[PDB]
Structure formats: structure tokens, C-alpha cells
Amino acid sequence: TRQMILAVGQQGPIARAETREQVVVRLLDMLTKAASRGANFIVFPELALTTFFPRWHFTDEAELDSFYETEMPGPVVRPLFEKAAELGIGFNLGYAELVVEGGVKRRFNTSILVDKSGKIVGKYRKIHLPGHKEYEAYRPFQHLEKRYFEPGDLGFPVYDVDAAKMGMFIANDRRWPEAWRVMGLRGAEIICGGYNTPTHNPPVPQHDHLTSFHHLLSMQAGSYQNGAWSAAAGKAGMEENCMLLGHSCIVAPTGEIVALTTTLEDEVITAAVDLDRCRELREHIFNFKQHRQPQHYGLIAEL
Amino acid sequence: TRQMILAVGQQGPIARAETREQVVVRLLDMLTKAASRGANFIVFPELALTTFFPRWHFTDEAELDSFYETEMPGPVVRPLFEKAAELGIGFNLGYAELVVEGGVKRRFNTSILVDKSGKIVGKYRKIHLPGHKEYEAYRPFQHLEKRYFEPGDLGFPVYDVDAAKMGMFIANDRRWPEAWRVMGLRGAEIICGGYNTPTHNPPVPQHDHLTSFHHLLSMQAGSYQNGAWSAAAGKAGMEENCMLLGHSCIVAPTGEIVALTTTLEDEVITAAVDLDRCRELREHIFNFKQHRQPQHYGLIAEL
Amino acid sequence: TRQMILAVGQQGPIARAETREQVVVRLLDMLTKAASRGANFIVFPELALTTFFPRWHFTDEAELDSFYETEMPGPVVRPLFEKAAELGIGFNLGYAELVVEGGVKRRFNTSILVDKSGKIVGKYRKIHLPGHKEYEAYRPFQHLEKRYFEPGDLGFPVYDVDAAKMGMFIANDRRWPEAWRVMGLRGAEIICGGYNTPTHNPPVPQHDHLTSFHHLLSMQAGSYQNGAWSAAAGKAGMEENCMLLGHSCIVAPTGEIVALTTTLEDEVITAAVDLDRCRELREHIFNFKQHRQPQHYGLIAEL
Amino acid sequence: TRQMILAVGQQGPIARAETREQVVVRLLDMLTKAASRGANFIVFPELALTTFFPRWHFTDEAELDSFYETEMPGPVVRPLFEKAAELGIGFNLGYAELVVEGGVKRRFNTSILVDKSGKIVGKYRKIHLPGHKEYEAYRPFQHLEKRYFEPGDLGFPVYDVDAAKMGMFIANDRRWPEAWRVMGLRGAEIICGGYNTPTHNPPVPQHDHLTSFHHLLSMQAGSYQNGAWSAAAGKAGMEENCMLLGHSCIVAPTGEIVALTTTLEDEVITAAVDLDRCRELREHIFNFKQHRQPQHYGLIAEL
Numbered sequence A, B, C, D: 001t002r003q004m005i006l007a008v009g010q011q012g013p014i015a016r017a018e019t020r021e022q023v024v025v026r027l028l029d030m031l032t033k034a035a036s037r038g039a040n041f042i043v044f045p046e047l048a049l050t051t052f053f054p055r056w057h058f059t060d061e062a063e064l065d066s067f068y069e070t071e072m073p074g075p076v077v078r079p080l081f082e083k084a085a086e087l088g089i090g091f092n093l094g095y096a097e098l099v100v101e102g103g104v105k106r107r108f109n110t111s112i113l114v115d116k117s118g119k120i121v122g123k124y125r126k127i128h129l130p131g132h133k134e135y136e137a138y139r140p141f142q143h144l145e146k147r148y149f150e151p152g153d154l155g156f157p158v159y160d161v162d163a164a165k166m167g168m169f170i171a172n173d174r175r176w177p178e179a180w181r182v183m184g185l186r187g188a189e190i191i192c193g194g195y196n197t198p199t200h201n202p203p204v205p206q207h208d209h210l211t212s213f214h215h216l217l218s219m220q221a222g223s224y225q226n227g228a229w230s231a232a233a234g235k236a237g238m239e240e241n242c243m244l245l246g247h248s249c250i251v252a253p254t255g256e257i258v259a260l261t262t263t264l265e266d267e268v269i270t271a272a273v274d275l276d277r278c279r280e281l282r283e284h285i286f287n288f289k290q291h292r293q294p295q296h297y298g299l300i301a302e303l
Ligand SMILES: CC(C)[C@@H](NC(N)=O)C(=O)O
Pocket: A046, A130, A131, A143, A170, A171, A172, A173, A175, A195, A196, A197, A198, B285
């Protein structure tokens, strides 16, 4: 019948001193809880294995590297995959990826989709990196993603995960219609990812009180206009003196929010998902083939 | 000058037999009221000179042709232009455009921008035509725009209207991120247009109660993600037995709705507009040149 | 830890010819589904055993009486109670109650709370009856609740249901702050009920497009201002030619909608409920004892 | 006359040393701008003449006293009244009222209504005082209103202001359904006031990201359920190192927001107001006399 139960595993803060073993325990706990509630897939936050390190300027490269994964899964994260396979619940995990290619230490803000058999189905590397590249004194806390990561090199793919077409986005990506549209054009039925969104923005603080609004607006508009179910898992709460936005959510292809977290701690929410619901949009008001006039969208792709 | 006062002139229903002279009287009234309240520009609905004729299945070309404009403006509509120049308030007027080229008729769902001097400074032709192509007996009312209009051939231009960079969308266009983005990439500070949106949709009636939601969601998301002020003028009310959506609105570049109509009759709303407000988005979170990666958006422009 | 999983069992239309046995099958199905997802309690709609008969004017008293329950549970509804006890999931059921007292045939729009042991814990009879008392020709469909029911005679009680303080409201009641406040003052941690809300209102059709908005606004404001979790189960869809509002929901004590249905058919939604969350409001911004000045609210209770 | 144009004059921060003369200049500017745009009444913030002093723990009564008004208006504030009479635009002004009775000081958080003739036609004193009573060291800023003000002693009156029945609320009051209902029962057509709402709350910081939501939710629900136009004027921005909420608004009796500010500085918004619109609610769904059952609301007035 093409139905399933989707879950979002919101994370509370992760301390700089908090170990990966300790984080995995928290992830295993949420995954198990989701499974008990019938979930077949659970979405975890962006960079969900450590504290959001981009908030600090590093001078020691060994220290910076400590926040990156060189294996996936490694012995420490392995338990999550084993449990996922055991309980038959896939997941989307975000983490910092360090890979050496041709003499270059490549760093990506990454996310992976694992199916209900514990097998990695696909990867995505954050294409829209927000923030800045150089330390900025006027900021109460940094957001050096442009310094610690390079734009993703995998485009915006859509993978078959347990009979569901799933596309991945990572945090800031959710605000760009292009990311949603490319995956929408690739037939995504579910577009999911996580985020680390401070409720304070140094560059434009006059938008602080609109942090939730902008986050939900992006999720709802993206889902609706592409007729795709969506889910966003944030890492929220006061993490290392920086308040992070909560309001993790699951959204229907109509843009209707069907599930929303209300705490700023580890929290699991779930919602029944009918993949055929996407047709109400993609076969009608948003029947791409019947209505789109791409001959007029060229500027969007100009370099 | 970077400050101005924008207005929206929502229309109540226009009867099948209501003359353009009578409609012009209503338009003049709203333009006059808007100017008295400081507005120097007012947005009117899509096809603001006639009843929404695409709701009927025509069998006589002469009857169909009667709903189109062969000149803009003709003697009947000219008074609106004269008053706009007198009071110093430009406008966006929607209408059905009939052009005869070498004995061949061309039909467009059109909108024009007139500056505070009463001069036409730009035209746009609806690119995204909603509805169906053939008569469908089950529908209480049809929506045969695909038959009565050709997709626009002017692309999504942005024009300078009295020191303001303005782009035009027409009804359905507002639901397509591509329309907004093209104009966003062309630097539009204001994106505006009108609409005739029935609160009932025959093919997907399960979205009827979401009519306001989808409309406002599209306007808010479009404004926010392109950092553009926006305005949507609807023709609402029970027109020829078909209930049309109201909730005409003016929206800030943050996506915040600053003005909204509450009736289903002719109604004017105004909002102070600072063209520099756009910078809060376009020079930061949505600084296009700094964050976009167009090399990965190619699929959006593929035919 | 004072936690539980609350569910809402939205109903699709119930035909005039649809039997109670057939309705009970649908209710049993949702209750079972909820239980499988970990729900300890499920809220069903107002008058959930029959079609919304108040929409018709009856001349035959025997026919009117056919829609009322004279027993609760009777042999037909008994299965629901048995299953509730089996699976350990309580519920809130709405139905038309007919009881003869002192020679008077009393009719109430009623709802009952049954605990996880299948035992009826408390009853509530609708105090705010909307609509009219006499047949009204100008209406496309009637809403004769004032004719078929008499205002409830049990006040707005709050009962202990499996260690949770629960208050009941029935449809229109949710729009009156007095109903919420009385139960709020009685310590309700969960305020729940169901509804039959046509998306069309004959008296004031200009509010039709606001049906969802007003319903959700009432649920959110009631929850927030009383620091109570809440849930509303509607019977939606096209029932006997009258479209009924969907958007069944579960709301947190902060007023945040945590679960929302998206179809207009039988649909189950669930949300984790922490009764202590009520304290975030009732012990602070809405600490009644510390902030209320009842010496100034007298007019609210004047006859 | 049943038509008018209502305005809201939102204030940006008022410094601790900013004089009343300087504040009056800002108020005159907004009143003048509002009138030029057709407004015949403008709502100003709570304590609109000084910085929000309740944020500090005072130890000197003379310093505290300096923030209160001993006369209304005194020579400094009089110019505002004169301009209101000149331009024909009344206003709602909030301020700290200090009264000396038989050698005894009485302190109130007050608001007055002045008609378009510049005459004071009504007064209200804040009944719901938020915050705490004793100094709390952990808080970055205090909120000692319970110490610097006595709960209002005028109840929730409704006054006739230039053919409009208006009621007053002050900040926190807007979150209490009782305040709105009393004025609703007294027939208010417009319920207005101002507010100083920090976007951060020390005791319950987990609701910080919901500050706008709770504010707007309270205004929308209050208007809808009492069928009253409403307006809330906030003093927003970073005032003395404390960020205050913006989103000043004008709301229709349907609960629909018709105007909203987007900056955190002095800002004027206006909306056309039809006093008869109230009837859409008060003569139908919320026809008090026809639907209310006050005999069951007694608990709300119990001391
Ligand atoms: C900094 C914030 C604007 C950005 N955060 C992120 N992790 O990508 C976001 O778009 O959520």
C-alpha cells in the first residue's frame, strides 16, 4: 500500500567534552523508542556525533580533525547500525567527513541514508555552506562552515531506500528552492535532513524572533511545491553557550506540519506516511511535465 | 529614494455582463483611495477588467473574444491611466490580451506595470497556466486557461518602475519557485501580481480547506527566499456562482505578511515599503553570489 | 514519570444508512492501530456512532430517536469497550444520549471518558449548543442542535483517568474560553473532545475559508492559556452532501500543535504526552493563584 | 459613523536617560504620520514615556519615582494632546502613574484613551502584573512589576471614544481570556493596548523561540472569540541591553491579522476599521445572549 511510519530523532545539546560513545547511547535510545512506536525510518540531526564545532576558530589542526569521522561506521558508531538492522529501522545520520584524496584532506558536512537492513544506501554532502570563512570578531560565536567544509560534490541525489525515494538536505540547504526542486525533479517522495540553527544570528539579529518561522516556512514551502513528505531533525537547546533552534518536524506533501517537537532535548516524533499522497500534488496542481516551462528557467542554472 | 507606500486593490466579483466602464469606476475608486492614504503604487487582480471567463466552455469565438483587450488602454480604460498620472500612483493591471499577427490570433493572460506618470513601463504574460485542456462534464465550473491562453513569451522580466525594481507574476505563477527565482536573480525588490483562485478544486477537493494556506505559504516563501517585498491582489467573492479566494496581501522580504484583506469585496490595503530592507536577506543568508552553486541546478533548466 | 501516548481517531463520513455495527468496526480498527503505536488513550469525534443527524429537520419522532443511544455500552458498542480493556487503551466517545426522567425525554449531545480498563470514568453533556431551533429555509443544510439537544447539566467536570486529569469539551465548546477556564481552574492536564464542523456556514459564509484557522486558533489558545495538553477529533469529509472539516489535532500546553491529520478519512495520529509539561505555564506565566484577580471577573458569571 | 482608520505607533527602545521631551518628539512624529495616512486613532505602547524600568532592582525611591507621571498631561506631554486635537486623531498612551493620597503613594501601570479632540475619555490600570516580587540574582534582567505597581482598581472598563466602543488592556493582560471577555461583555468594538515583552524569559527560557507565537496567538484568539477589532503596540528593540518583542499588530474581529510591523524601531501601521464587522461574530457564532450559559461559569469569578 506504500505506507510507512517516519520518525525524527531530535537531539538535545552535545557538549564539547561529550564522547561519541555517549552520543551513540542517546541515538540508540531514540532509535529504539521510534521502533517501538512503529517507525521504519528515523531522521537524526546534522553533525549528530559531536558538538557544533564550527562555532569556534581552531589553530590546532589535530584538534579540528578530532571532530571528523574517518570511517562510517567505526567501532563506536557500529552499534547504531547493528540496532537499526535488528529492529528494522533505517536512518539518516549527519556527521563531519574527513577523506584524503590525491594529497588533499577533504572535509565535508555529510549525511547518509541507511536502510532497515543497516546498509548504507546513499550519501550526500552539504552544498549550501552558510556562515563565513574567516574569524569574525563582532560575532558572539562563529559559524565557520565555509572554513571547515567544502561544498558537496555529489549534487542532490535521490535514492531508493526500502521502496521509498528519499532525497537528502543538510540544514541551510532547506532554505534554497533549488535543492528541493532538483530532488523534486528526481522524483523524491521524502526529503529529509537535520540542522544546527542558532536562534541568534550576528549578521542580522533583527530576524532572531523569526528563527522558527523561517525554518518552518522553508520546510512547508519545500514540501508543498514539490509534493514531497519532509522531515527536519535539529540539535537544539543551549549547546556550549549557544541556543539552538528546536521545532524539529515532519511535513506532508501538502506542506501541512504533521508532527512537531516541543522540547529542546532528545525527542522522538513520528507520523504515518503514505507515499501515494504525493500524487495529490505531483499529478495535479504541480504536475511538472504538464505545467513547467523550463525554456524560461535558464537563468537559475547560469554560472 | 528608497522609500514608498505600496497598495493592493482587491476586487470583489465582476459579473459576466458587468461592463469595463463599470469596472473602471471601481478601479478608479480604489486607486483614488490608495493615493489618499499615501500609496504611490497599487496592484490590481489578474484579469481585472472582466469576469473570470475561463470557467466556461466556449463554443463561439466572438463571445470568447469579447473578454479580451485589443488595445491598452482603449477609450474605456484610459481614465484609469489619466487618474494614475494625476495622483502620482502607478499600478499593475491584469487583463486578457488578444493580438492579431498576420491574420493569426494570439491570446495571453497579461499584466502590465504603469508608473506614477501613467506610462506603461513593462509587460508580463502568464507562463504557468493551471487547469485542464478539454471540457470536463463533472466539474461545477471549468478552468480552461490552457485553451484560452498561450504560455507567456516574455519570460520573467524585472522592470524599473519609479526607482523600484519590480517583477510580475500572475496567479498560478506564485506557486512556482522558478518564477520567483528568475526575478530574484534579476534583482527584483518588489514581486507582485493578482489572482482568481476558486476555494474549491474539482480534481482535488481534499485541499479546499487549505486554499488560504497554500496561497499565503507561496507568497511568504517566495518573498523570504528571494528577499523581495511582494503583493498579491485577488478578485474574490461569489463570482458567477464560484467562490473565489480573498486574503489579498502585502509581504515583507522576510516573508512576514504586513497587510491582509478580510472582506471578499473591493478592498484596499497599504504598507510602507523600504526598498533597502531587501538587503537583510540578499546581502546575508541569501547572498546569491556568495552561497549559490548553480553548477548543480542544471536539472531545473532541462527541457 | 507521568508520561503517556495520546491518540486521536479522526473519522471519515458516516452515512445515514451506515449501521452502528459498521461504525464500531471502524472505531475498533483505529483503536487497535493506536494501541500498536503505543497509545494509552484515544479521542474519538462528537456523535461518533451515526451521521450528523442535526442537519435534517425531522417530523417523525421515532426516526429522530433512532440516532440516540439508550444504553452505553449496548451490545453493539460493547466490543469497543472490551477491546479498550484488552489493549489497555482508554478513550473518549461522543454520542447522542436519550434518557427519560420524570416523564421527560431528555436529549443530550454527550461524551464519555473510559479508562484503560474499559471502565467509564466520567460523562459530559454539551453545554454550548450551536445552530438554531427552528427549520431555516435559507440554509442549504440545517444545524438543529438547539432543537435536538438541551444544554448539558453536568457543568465542565475534570476526571481522574488513569492518573491523568482530563476535561471534556464537545465541538462548539472549544470556541468558548469559559469552558476551557473552568476545567483549567479544576486542574485539567488534558482537555479533549471531538467535532462536526461543516466548512460552510450559512449564516456567515464569508468566514468559510477560515474554518480551519478558527478551529486551530481555538485549540491552540485554549491549551496555551490554561497550560493544558489538548486534542480534537473531528468527523470529516463529504458526509451526506455536507463537507466536514478535518485537521484533527493534538496540542501541547504551550499551544504548539504536535500532531495534525491531513486526510478527510478515518485517521489516527499520536503524540507523546508529559503531564508535567503543564507546569511550564501553570507554575509561571499562568500561575493562576499568583496572577489572577477574580474580584474583577464577576461580569463573566452574571446571569 | 461606523468606519474609521486605526493606527499603531510601535516604539523602538527608550534609553534610561532619554527625556520625556525626546520621547514626545518621537510620539508626535508617529501621530502626525498616522494622521497623514487617514488614521483617526493611534495606539502607543505600555509605559511609552520611559525606558522599561521594572527591569532593575531599585533601592532609592526618588530614582524610582522619577519614572512616574504625577500629572497627565504635564507641560512636557501636553504638545502630544494639542497635536492630536489639531489633526483629529485620538490615542492610547501608556505610562507609570504615581498618585499621592493623604500622604500615601499609589503606583499603577496605566493607559488612557484620548479622543480626536485631545480629551481624556477613559483610564485603565493594569490588573495582571507579570514577573516576580523579590530580587532574583540569576536573572540578566528583572521584572519587578509586582513591586513597583499595585493591581489596577478600575476593572476592565469600555469607553466611548469618538463613536467607537473601546476597551484597554496592558501588556500581560492580553494573555488572560478574562480581561477580553469582561470587555467583550461590555460591548467593546475595539480592544487595544501596548506591551514590553522581552524575547527572553529567565524562568522559562524554553519558550523564548515562541515569544512572537504566544503574543500573536493571544491577540488573534481574543479578537475572534469576542468579535472585536484589536491592536497591540509594542516597544521593541535592544533596550538597555534587553531585547524586546516587535510584531506590533492590528487584528480583525475574526482574529485575522490585518497589519503587522517588521522592524524593531518606531513604526506606524494602519488598517481600515468597520465597527459593524463585529456583528459577524457577535450576532452569530458568538451571539453571547443566545449561546452562553453563565450559570456554569461561576468558578471563574470565585476568589
Ligand atoms: C546558521 C543558520 C542560518 C544555518 N545553520 C546551518 N547549520 O546550516 C541554517 O540555515 O540553518
